[PDB]
Amino acid sequence: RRRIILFPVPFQGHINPILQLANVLYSKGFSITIFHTNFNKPKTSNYPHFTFRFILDNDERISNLPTHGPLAGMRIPIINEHGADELRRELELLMLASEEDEEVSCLITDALWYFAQSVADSLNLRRLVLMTSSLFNFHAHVSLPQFDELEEQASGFPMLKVKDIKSAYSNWQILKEILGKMIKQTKASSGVIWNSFKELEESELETVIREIPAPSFLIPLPKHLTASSSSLLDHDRTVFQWLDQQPPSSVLYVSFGSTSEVDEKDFLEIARGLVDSKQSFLWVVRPGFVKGSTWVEPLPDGFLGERGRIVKWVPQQEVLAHGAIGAFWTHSGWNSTLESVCEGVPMIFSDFGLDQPLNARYMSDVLKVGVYLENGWERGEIANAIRRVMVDEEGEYIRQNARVLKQKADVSLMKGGSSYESLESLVSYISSL
Numbered sequence: 355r356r357r358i359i360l361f362p363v364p365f366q367g368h369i370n371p372i373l374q375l376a377n378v379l380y381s382k383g384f385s386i387t388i389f390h391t392n393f394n395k396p397k398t399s400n401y402p403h404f405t406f407r408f409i410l411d412n413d414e415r416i417s418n419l420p421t422h423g424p425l426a427g428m429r430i431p432i433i434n435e436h437g438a439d440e441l442r443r444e445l446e447l448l449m450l451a452s453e454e455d456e457e458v459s460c461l462i463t464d465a466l467w468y469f470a471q472s473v474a475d476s477l478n479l480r481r482l483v484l485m486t487s488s489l490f491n492f493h494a495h496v497s498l499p500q501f502d503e504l505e506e507q508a509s510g511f512p513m514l515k516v517k518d519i520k521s522a523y524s525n526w527q528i529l530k531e532i533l534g535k536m537i538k539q540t541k542a543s544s545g546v547i548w549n550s551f552k553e554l555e556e557s558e559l560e561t562v563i564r565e566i567p568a569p570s571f572l573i574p575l576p577k578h579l580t581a582s583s584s585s586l587l588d589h590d591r592t593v594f595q596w597l598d599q600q601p602p603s604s605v606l607y608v609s610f611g612s613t614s615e616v617d618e619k620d621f622l623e624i625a626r627g628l629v630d631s632k633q634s635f636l637w638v639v640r641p642g643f644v645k646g647s648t649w650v651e652p653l654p655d656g657f658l659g660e661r662g663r664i665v666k667w668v669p670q671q672e673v674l675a676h677g678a679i680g681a682f683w684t685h686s687g688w689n690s691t692l693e694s695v696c697e698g699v700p701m702i703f704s705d706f707g708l709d710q711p712l713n714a715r716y717m718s719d720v721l722k723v724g725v726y727l728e729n730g731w732e733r734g735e736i737a738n739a740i741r742r743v744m745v746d747e748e749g750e751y752i753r754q755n756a757r758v759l760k761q762k763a764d765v766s767l768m769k770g771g772s773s774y775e776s777l778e779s780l781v782s783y784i785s786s787l
């Protein structure tokens with residue numbers, strides 16, 4: 355009796371949170387249509403209860419781009435600057451074809467689809483925005499003019515060091531423009547859904563209240579459901595029979611997300627830090643991860659030994675919840691970070707720029723749930739980080755913080771919790787649009 359249209363950005367880390375939201379909203383009585391590009395499409399047969407519509411790449415034009423590297427997502431700007439007419443065409447089709455007693459309540463877009471705002475306005479259709487990065491991260495964007503007028507303790511941001519900012523915003527006419535339209539149009543939206551929870555980013559709520567005149571809602575989506583049904587790669591599910599053989603809290607999970615890439619100098623250094631830590635590890639290396647190779651070709655044989663295993667892909671949150679996991683070495687993508695937080699797993703942080711440095715520093719020095727490794731890649735430093743989080747008594751407090759943080763995330767979903775009442779408002783709000 356009330357349908358919601360959800361249009362994600364076709365990259366994991368963007369597909370994952372939006373389909374989590376859609377499932378949650380489905381949990382609350384709404385119908386779901388997903389607008390998706392054919393590129394990077396998820397497995398629609400995992401969502402029998404969703405209707406999928408494929409758009410904007412079907413009859414191609416400027417999107418005959420490469421499918422796998424740092425230059426896909428050039429689709430993002432292209433579609434932003436050229437997709438408006440098709441989007442309006444497709445939305446109008448769907449609103450024609452519903453109704454008997456089925457309105458369309460709103461359109462929820464990834465905040466990167468800033469072109470969607472004027473399209474929805476043109477159809478008198480409320481639009482809601484979904485942020486896939488943190489509130490802290492929005493607090494640094496919407497402060498990127500004090501930074502410009504000007505190495506350690508960033509002025510007006512004691513959380514961060516200058517290294518942090520100068521690595522985060524190091525491509526800054528490259529995405530200056532589209533980062534700002536993004537903000538411009540989520541301010542002008544009818545509401546913003548944030549994938550976190552109030553007690554995770556309490557220090558950041560004031561900014562969001564004062565910068566964004568639309569209502570905000572903080573929902574830790576990974577506490578509602580994992581993102582597994584929206585996996586673009588196939589799960590290596592054999593890891594769990596191997597995890598069932600390990601003692602509790604004695605495996606380090608290692609994974610640098612869906613898009614990062616490292617050059618062989620560094621890939622072989624990470625291996626040795628793993629071996630040098632003498633901890634057991636389950637290492638996800640996406641085929642593509644390494645400069646030179648397809649998968650993990652520069653790796654010698656048995657080099658990991660009896661304690662190491664390597665795979666192309668897992669159901670990450672489910673692994674983070676297995677009792678064998680004692681720590682998570684991550685590139686600090688916001689989804690991974692939130693998943694590890696919601697499962698109570700402490701982290702070792704690396705990063706590849708772009709919100710990742712700020713996620714790492716916030717979890718490292720504010721919440722104190724991990725060790726920020728990046729002054730580079732060095733074996734002994736890597737081994738020291740793994741052991742301080744996993745074994746050292748010095749790091750008992752980080753492990754303890756991780757457990758309490760998860761409890762805070764659990765409590766927030768209970769009646770009178772921040773996340774509970776946030777979701778309750780969101781449903782109420784959408785139902786009156």
Ligand SMILES: O=c1ccn([C@@H]2O[C@H](COP(=O)(O)OP(=O)(O)O)[C@@H](O)[C@H]2O)c(=O)[nH]1
Nearest residue numbers: 367611612613638667668670687688689690
């Ligand atoms: O082997 C893997 C590696 C990662 N992921 C998921 O991929 C997403 C990556 O999102 P994130 O923001 O952390 O990283 P990004 O790829 O955007 O840098 C997370 O939900 C992970 O749980 C997964 O399911 N299996």
